[PDB]
Design a protein around this nucleic acid. Structure first.
Length: 43
RNA sequence: ACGAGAACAUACGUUCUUUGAACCAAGCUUCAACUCC
C-alpha cells in the first residue's frame, strides 16, 4: 500500500509508538535499538 | 512719694476658586488524550 501519491498521515488512533515519535531519523538500526532500550528496558 | 499714672496691638476676613489618575496594550505563546503490554 505504498507509494500511492503519497499523501498519508497517521492521526492519533493508537497508531503506535513509532507513529507518535519522530526518531526513525536517520537510520534503521541505531534508532531501533535506541527506542528498544528506551521503552522496553525500563518497563 | 520712680518722666510717672490709667491703657488687651485689638476689631473685621472660608487656604479658597477652576482640574476624569488619565492615555496606549489579545491572558496570550508553544503543546496530538496519549504510550505500553
Amino acid at each position: 500500500p505504498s507509494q500511492n501519491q503519497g499523501e498519508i498521515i497517521y492521526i492519533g488512533g493508537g497508531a503506535g509508538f513509532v507513529s507518535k515519535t519522530l526518531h526513525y531519523k536517520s537510520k534503521n538500526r541505531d534508532q531501533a535499538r535506541n527506542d528498544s532500550f528506551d521503552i522496553l528496558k525500563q518497563l
